[PDB]
Design a protein around this nucleic acid. Sequence first.
RNA 1: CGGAGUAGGGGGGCGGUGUAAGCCGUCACCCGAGAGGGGAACAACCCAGACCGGGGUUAAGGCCCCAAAGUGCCGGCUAAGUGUUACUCCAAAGGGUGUCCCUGGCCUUAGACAGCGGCCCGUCGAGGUCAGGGGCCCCGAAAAUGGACGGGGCUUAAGCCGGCCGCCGAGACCCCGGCGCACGGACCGAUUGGUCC
RNA 2: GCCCGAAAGGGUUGACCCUCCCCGAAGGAAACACGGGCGACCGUGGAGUACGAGGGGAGGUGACCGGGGUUGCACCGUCCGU
Lengths: 183, 142, 63, 171, 86, 74
Amino acid sequence: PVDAWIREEIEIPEGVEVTVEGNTVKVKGPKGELQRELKYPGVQIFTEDGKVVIYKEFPRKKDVAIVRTFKAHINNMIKGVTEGFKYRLKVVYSHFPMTVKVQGDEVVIENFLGEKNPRRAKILPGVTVKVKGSEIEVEGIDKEAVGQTAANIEQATRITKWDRRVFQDGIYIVEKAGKPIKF
Amino acid sequence: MRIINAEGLILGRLASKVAKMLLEGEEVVIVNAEKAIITGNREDIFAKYKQRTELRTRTNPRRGPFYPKRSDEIVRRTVRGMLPWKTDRGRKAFKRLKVYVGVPKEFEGKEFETISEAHMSRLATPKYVTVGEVAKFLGGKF
Amino acid sequence: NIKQTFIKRTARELFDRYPDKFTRDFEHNKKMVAELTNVTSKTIRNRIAGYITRLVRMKEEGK
Amino acid sequence: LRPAKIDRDVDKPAYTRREYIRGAPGPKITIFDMGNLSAEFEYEVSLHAEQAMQIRQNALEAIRIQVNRYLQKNVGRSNYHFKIRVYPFQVLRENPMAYGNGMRRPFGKPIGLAARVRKDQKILTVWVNGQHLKFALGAMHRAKMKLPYSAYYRIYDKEGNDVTTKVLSTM
Amino acid sequence: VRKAVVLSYVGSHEHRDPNRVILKPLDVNDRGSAARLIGRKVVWRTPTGRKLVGKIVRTHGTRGEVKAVFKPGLPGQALGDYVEIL
Amino acid sequence: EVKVFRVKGTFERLGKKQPFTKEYRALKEEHVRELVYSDIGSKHRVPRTKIWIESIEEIKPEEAEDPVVRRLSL
RNA sequence: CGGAGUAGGGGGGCGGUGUAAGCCGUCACCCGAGAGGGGAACAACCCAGACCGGGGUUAAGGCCCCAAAGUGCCGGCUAAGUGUUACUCCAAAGGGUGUCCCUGGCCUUAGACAGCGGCCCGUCGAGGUCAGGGGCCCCGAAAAUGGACGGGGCUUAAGCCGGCCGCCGAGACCCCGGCGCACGGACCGAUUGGUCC
RNA sequence: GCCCGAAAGGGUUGACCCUCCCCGAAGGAAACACGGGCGACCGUGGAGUACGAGGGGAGGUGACCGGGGUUGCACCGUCCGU
């Protein structure tokens, strides 16, 4: 195989409480509490005094990849319950300005390409959207739900019938978790 | 009668043991049929079972293969496949079997046997599906 | 002498019949084997008990 | 024309003698040496047959044209001594049946020519210097494509010893 | 009562011997020592109380079954039934 | 004392010979020989007659070139 | 000396011919003119040549259930139900950071990405990067009544590779008892012979 | 399993069944005790014992057995002539 006893370790920060209940990871922090189930044959997640340790005792490539993925997920949970995540969207149009508004658990877009019908995007629980003109912010505590809400707001505006070199109207992500999108 | 709980058991191995019991001459009852598992890939499994259900005689459908859509009938049919079904001996042995989804109030209050040769733990590859999920895909009541 | 196939088979049948009275403790397993079985040999009984202990370990855990 | 899987194999007796074969055809290949012929290059890149084979002169000529055009556009006539080593001596025949008489008196009339090659035999060679091994390998690939069975290339030095792995590692 | 179950006739998948029978003793101790029954008589009862008598000859396999001869042979109505050892 | 062994040899597949060098932990060299046979047979589909061993020489844990054995031996 | 039958051959291996299937020869093992035990069923592929009644041990092959015998052991591989096909009776050229191995070079305690800073350093500071070859799998891969690993089904297997240990299984082989036949012999018949060894 | 069974077949000078004793072809165990093997298992002793197709004998109960018609279970079996 690759090595003998692959072992990854994460240091627990200021006031974050990390617990295991058999295959779940509970993560409490100054804001919010998160849960997540992570299991793979032979992978053990247990807590030391001040550490999260992920272990497998005779691993192959795919097991190594699984372990690193689990480590990344746990780090994301910690960072989320500590600070949070923030995505940014930009609205653009050429003709027919469209109005975006928040209605309960849905974002509604009107006058897109001049349609008499509104487009709708579903907001997931625990996420908050703020619209100030041409810029939108999705703030939240968990990265998956935040990114999914952003992606839904984007995919509510997609064209298939006309050339996009000319028809470019819509809403676009510009910043993922603090990481600009560049060509 | 020997009452067997199917929670967490591999279907074909369970069926092999049960068929040999029946031929030796015991009466068998199986509870919790919807909780036995089938190993492999979801799409391959679902395709196989759909293909089974879409088999029919082209001149008369009142005749024709009647492959099941329910979990208990699926388990029963696996067992029947494991017997000599064209003989009085096998017909009697198969008549000596009953299968149930869940645990009916009748059997409520008893201790259930298991089978060691058949249990989810001898496995190492996580790819597995549930008979209840198969039944839901096929469109059967429980 | 007495072979291990006989032991594993008998232990497997005992566990199948009564998967509620056997635990992870070697000595309790010995006692329950002596109770629920009509064997007449400490050797056979203790071997059955060990194999039942392994069975319970495996049926609790799993890869 | 007819597919090459008919003539690929070598299970028939040799049929290479023209004082007895009536109406045999001439070759459609006349050039077997191209480039610079008196220039004492370093590296010799040679193709080798993986199993016994029977190559048509059509395939031979196509290989020639393609590989030579490539080597000219990329390396330059001043380099790349290119040689084909095998000549077509076998005569291929077809039964004149398809009113007809079917399988009555079946003995084919001659149609074409082919070269016979045995396992681990050289077919063609490019003599080149270090700075053009890339293009020599490209030519190897292009020729490999146009053959009925598979073939492997090797490299040789002056004194004709194998340095293929050492030269492949260090590019 | 020191009894056993009749399992099958002797033979292969394609043919069988109808004067020989495979028996499974039910007591775990007899199953652990099945060779200590070689030479013993073994009886089957008919629906009319008649008696058919046979003899255990040798062991069959390794799980604890035995082989028995019954001339005059048993009927097919006796293949998942009980038999009494003497 | 649990010894570390190094094995050298050749194996032939489809008429082409190929050298190999390996490292094992064991008490003796017979175990090493059986393991070598089984592993090469599995991974390259070679029978035992087409496997030739020249040397099974005992080395020390720190002059080795295999990470699993190195970590098992410290 | 006398009495015949045979003058359409076939399977399997080799040779000439032919796109191939087939045509023509050759060898003389089999079917024809050959029971029984296996290959799902199969004229000729495997074991094996048959008087009658019995008792045992093996062969071909097989041991999750159908179905007699192992849910057998050790080491490894496959994730595609691929496969579960000795043959009769199974799709390729060309490709694949899919995984498991072998080999040979080149950089390394500041390397090979990204990054603070326009070939340079302060940091992420521990091994990495190119070439060849092998095993298993994947893409390439479309057909007509509803359906075929013999079926059920099987995933550290009930699959594959390298090896091993026990058991089941023929009319074959050993043994007991009976019938006949061939050859020779002794004794004995009023005709083609009889009783016994 | 149900039915028929006077005579021509056996049988009260003893049908059938039960118990014990002797010999015994080829073949042929096991429990248990001591060791080898990672292991499935094996070796030594028990033991050429228990058993074994058949061949004989001794004591008990006392009336059917063989045969025929039809049917049930298990396995096998694709007609005759050319």
